[PDB]
């Protein structure tokens, strides 16, 4: 899983 | 004075790229307490891909979820990689600082948007943009040579590929090399005159592509051949004058500071596209 750095922050698994 | 200064700026590879080319590992970054090597060139590398030895799997294939997997990101939800240019522009349509970036920079920023430390880390994955189908591939594996054995190279199969680090500048079109210079020969500006490179290393080459291929092989590398002190910071045999008549690739490791008009030559660099001329 990853977390976006640029807003809006979300999670991508 | 030297009138070539502004024009020749993009060929000061040590300054405008600032890292390895053949193997780019010019920075480090911590992920959960451990340091990792990372690509950090500021220019895109046209035509660069990774050849996977023994195995028949191409390197743009998703990483194994080992010999059956490549270097790229595995499927995600939502699917972030691979992503088309139009897919990326749509993905960032609310961000004015990102949505209008050129395809290469956008691809670089897209890959750099994925934080593996889920605290802020400095780790940003490298990326490959394929001009063929306009797709951005985020590379899960930042490694570039190991001789799972693999190696970097210019190749006909990779000619539409573009290797992108996290530091690809948004004005690479202006300050980075791409096309080869037709009827031109790299030189050194001395006392109001453009002189030849005093010393070159002559490699035979059948065409421009094979010359660009050779220059890449000998170019700046942040990792010793056959597997921080290893950082080149852009220093290396990054340039080559190709004499198409004598079929000689004249490779040298000092930055050129002017151009000589000669219809027998084409000026190439390790960063440059292996085919395109101007």
For chain B, what are the domain ranges?
A: 3-11+179-219+237-278, 12-178
Is residue B78 reached through a cis peptide bond, with omega within 30 degrees of 0 on the bond before it?
A: yes
Determine the 3-state secondary structure of B54 from DSSP.
coil
Beta carbons of A13 and B77 less than 8 Å apart:
yes
Distance CA B243, CA B199 (A): 15
What are the CA-CA distances from residue B200 to residues B196, B210, B243, B275 (Å)? 10, 17, 12, 22
Question: Which is nearest to B145 in space by CA: B222, B45, B73?
Answer: B222
H/E element holding B178?
none
Question: CA of B76, closest CA in chain A: separation in Å?
Answer: 6
What are residue B68's DSSP bridge partners? none
Experimental structure resolution, Å:
2.3
> Solved how?
X-ray
Least CB–CB distance from B113: residue in A4, A11, A13: A4
Please list, in sequence order, all residues whose beta carbon lies within 8 angstroms of the beta carbon of residue B149, skipping any fewer than 6 positions away: B52, B53, B54
Chain A residues inside the 8 Å CB shell of B114:
2-5, 12
Q: What are B233's two structure tokens? A: 């910071």
CB contacts of A6 in chain B (<8 Å) are: 92, 95, 98, 113
Distance (Å, whole) CA B189 – CA B258: 6
Burial of B9 (0-12, 13-18, 19+ CB in 10 A): middle
Token pair listed for B159: 């000619």
Lookup result for tokens 């970097």: B152
Q: Can you tell me the distance from the alpha carbon of B12 to that of B66, in angstroms, rounded to the nearest whole number? A: 39
B249 neighbors B240 (Cβ within 8 angstroms): yes
Structurally, at CATH architecture level, domain B3-11+179-219+237-278 sits in 3-Layer(bba) Sandwich (3.50)
Cα dihedral B202/B187/B156/B221 (nearest 10): 80
If DSSP codes are grouped into helix, strand and coil, which group holds residue B86?
Answer: helix
Q: Does B95 contact A12 at a Cβ distance shorter than 8 Å?
A: no
Candidates B106, B142, B112; CA nearest to B124 is: B112
């Amino acid at each position: 899983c990853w977390t976006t750095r640029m807003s809006p922050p979300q999670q991508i698994c | 004075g030297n009138p070539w200064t502004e024009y020749m700026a993009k060929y000061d590879i040590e300054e405008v790229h600032g890292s390895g080319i053949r193997v780019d590992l010019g920075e480090d970054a911590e992920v959960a307490g451990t340091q990792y090597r990372l690509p950090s060139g500021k220019c895109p590398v046209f035509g660069k891909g990774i050849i996977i030895e023994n195995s028949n799997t191409t390197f743009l294939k998703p990483v194994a979820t080992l010999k059956d997997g490549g270097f790229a990101f595995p499927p995600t939800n939502p699917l972030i990689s691979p992503m088309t240019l139009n897919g990326m522009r749509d993905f960032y349509k609310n961000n004015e600082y990102v949505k209008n970036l050129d395809e290469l920079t956008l691809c670089s920023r897209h890959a750099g948007n994925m934080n593996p430390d889920n605290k802020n880390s400095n780790y940003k994955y490298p990326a490959v943009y394929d001009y063929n189908d306009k797709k951005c591939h985020i590379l899960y594996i930042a490694a570039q040579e190991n001789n799972f054995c693999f190696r970097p190279a210019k190749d006909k199969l990779f000619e539409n590929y573009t290797y992108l680090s996290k530091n690809v500048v948004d004005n690479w079109e202006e300050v980075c090399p791409r096309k080869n210079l037709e009827n031109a020969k790299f030189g050194l500006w001395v006392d109001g005159n453009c002189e030849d490179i005093p010393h070159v290393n002559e490699f035979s080459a059948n065409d421009l592509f094979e010359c660009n291929k050779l220059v890449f092989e000998l170019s700046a590398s942040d990792q010793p051949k056959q597997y921080d002190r290893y950082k080149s910071h852009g220093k290396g045999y990054n340039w080559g004058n190709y004499n198409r008549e004598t079929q000689k690739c004249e490779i040298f490791n000092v930055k050129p500071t002017c151009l000589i008009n000669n219809s027998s030559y084409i000026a190439t660099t390790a960063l440059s596209h292996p085919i395109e001329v101007e």
